[PDB]
């Protein structure tokens, strides 16, 4: 949920 | 009579002692326009939630200090990215949260829509938009997430949001 | 002294002391102050809205012309069964239209109808969809969700009609 | 900064016609009057958005309902009049009644009336549900005199200060 | 057809009976300006946590300026309720702008941070702030008030 | 409840 | 409390 | 045992 966003932030940037 | 300066910034506190106008109907437009601005500012702080519950968060109180007041949020964040001015990770996460509160998702979506359907910017925009929205539901949890981010990745998240901040604003 | 900040016109300047522009509303032209108020009002309201969430990161599942369409486009396109719109996502846009509506304007429409006119019942239904959505919009969405296809399509159709009615005149 | 024609839907709030709107949604290019009208519509929204208070009585208005209650016409129930009276209290501002109160000569009977109405406006501001509970407990002549004096004050403030 | 006077102050409660205009498109700009001031005041007051005419005459400032020179029926339990309101009128940002102008180790910085924290704490909880202001030594309370008043005076007078 | 509205809708459209 | 205000209202009207 | 209002008590004394 906030884990989902952690994932996508690493995958970006 | 001239509008009451105090009243232009909120509410006169001087009683009948005050010789100036508190009657909005006899006011020039400009005094009426300026007051509506001081007033909006006050409203936004009281319902700010996150702008009040920050007493309880680490890295926050350092943003209220002389040296950093002069820098502002943007300055504090540039200094974190730049590795000058001794900024704690937890301070730049709070500052980050402040920068996102200042942005509006729909401006990013209109920037998103100008891009091509192969632009690498589209992914960065959607990650930023998801930070703005998360921070609005729950900034405590968003500040928490920001702080888990590897320093290098976090600094990139900030740099992109700073760039976006600018592009929205001047054009 | 200087021109209006421009970071200030949109909310609050975050550049601290480095900024050369004016943060002092006393020295601002009227238009600037009018623009600021608008941006600031849009923010205040947004901050009271209960987010229907970070579902833009879900452009992985491929439904992304919801911006070019807009809420009304999406609703119109769910109704005439075009452009693949999920019931679920049209319940979402529905909630966004009902936030955009004012009950009082509808009450005014209801006056201009004859007694026993079948529209009074529609207006009244529309009104309590507006009233329900102001409090709990997950449930209202999860109600609209559990509403038959042709009931939903109809509801929305009259909501759009009213929505259009009110503004153009 | 290139004046264009404002979107009518944007004036009333936020345009929902996506990119198929060929109107201005950019405030920098709006005539000032468009910007003044929009703010009034938005303020209304901001105000309704902070409310968890709760037939043809609509024609009457909150005022007409209450005058009917007083005048014993139109069959207004006690409950409906307490509810409307709470809407009327919500509309008034203690600070205004205070300046009215200040014009009164020492020991004027109207002073006590003004302080009680302030107590209702303030009491209605903290818990309108509990304030309605109170207005329902009042003797019906006492409730009618109370309403009456608040509509008096309401009418009095509005027309001149 | 002129703006409804009840509408300028808020919302007209007269229903279909009203002769005047309720349509913001047809209003002169000054009506629209005045209305947003009433409306903003209302929005504010209803996010709050809240003889007696003699006190009103003076004003919150009048009331505080009294207690400093111990006259006009000035009391502690009341001076603190006034103090509370003064602090509500102030915000932190102006104090910081004032703080940014004092040289290093200049003692005013410490008063400024105390006022600031009075503002912030007054916003969390006015009752416990008043509880606290009612707990102070009279001479120290009179100094806090004296200082906040100065701050308040000078933010506006330029 | 929301129950009353479900009925109300269905009946009216 | 609210009885404080009831007592008063009786008196003034 | 530490609340904000009690530090702010002592804060005021040490300052005025
Ligand atoms: Zn004044
Ligand atoms: Zn600036
Ligand atoms: Zn439009
Ligand atoms: Zn009217």
Numbering used by the authors:
A (entry chain H), F (entry chain I), G (entry chain J): 8 to 20
B (entry chain F): 4 to 174
C (entry chain C): 3 to 55, 59 to 174
D (entry chain A): 1 to 54, 69 to 175
E (entry chain E): 4 to 53, 67 to 174
H (entry chain G): 5 to 20
The authors write:
We present the crystal structure of M2-1 in complex with the P interaction domain, at a resolution of 2.4 Å, which defines the orientation of the M2-1 and P moieties in the heteromultimeric complex. The electron density difference maps revealed a continuous area of density not accounted for by M2-1 and which appeared to be a peptide that exhibited helical secondary structure. On the basis of this model, we propose that, in the absence of RNA, each M2-1 tetramer associates with a single P tetramer, with all four P binding sites of M2-1 being occupied. The M2-1/P interface includes ionic, hydrophobic, and hydrogen bond interactions, and the critical contribution of these contacts to complex formation was assessed using a minigenome assay. There is a total of 10 plausible hydrogen bonds, with R126 making what appear to be important salt bridges to E104 and E107. There are a multitude of hydrophobic interactions along the length of the P peptide, highlighted by L148 of M2-1 packing against L101 and Y102 of the P peptide. The root mean square deviation (RMSD) on superposition of 158 carbon alphas is only 1.097 Å, suggesting very little structural rearrangement on P binding. The M2-1 side chains of R126 and Y134 move to satisfy the hydrogen bonds, as described in Fig. 3, but other than that, there is little movement of side chains required to accommodate the P peptide. The loop on M2-1 containing S58 and S61 (19), which are dynamically phosphorylated in HRSV-infected cells, appears to be slightly more ordered (the electron density for this region is clearer) in the complex crystal structure. The simultaneous incorporation of altered M2-1 and P proteins had an additive effect on minigenome activity, with most reduced activity exhibited by combining mutants R126E and F98A, which reduced eGFP expression to that of the minus M2-1 control.
The events that dictate whether the HRSV RdRp either transcribes or replicates are unclear, although the components of a replicating RdRp and a transcribing RdRp are different; the replicase requires the phosphoprotein (P), along with the large catalytic component (L), whereas the transcriptase additionally requires the M2-1 protein. M2-1 is 194 amino acids in length, binds zinc atoms, and exists in solution as a tetramer. Of these, the best-characterized role is that of a transcription factor, in which M2-1 is thought to enhance polymerase processivity by suppressing transcription termination both intragenically and intergenically. In addition, M2-1 interacts with both viral RNA and P. This ability of M2-1 to interact with RNA and P is required for productive transcription, and each monomer within the tetramer can potentially interact with both an RNA molecule and P at an overlapping binding site, suggesting that binding of these ligands at each binding site is mutually exclusive.
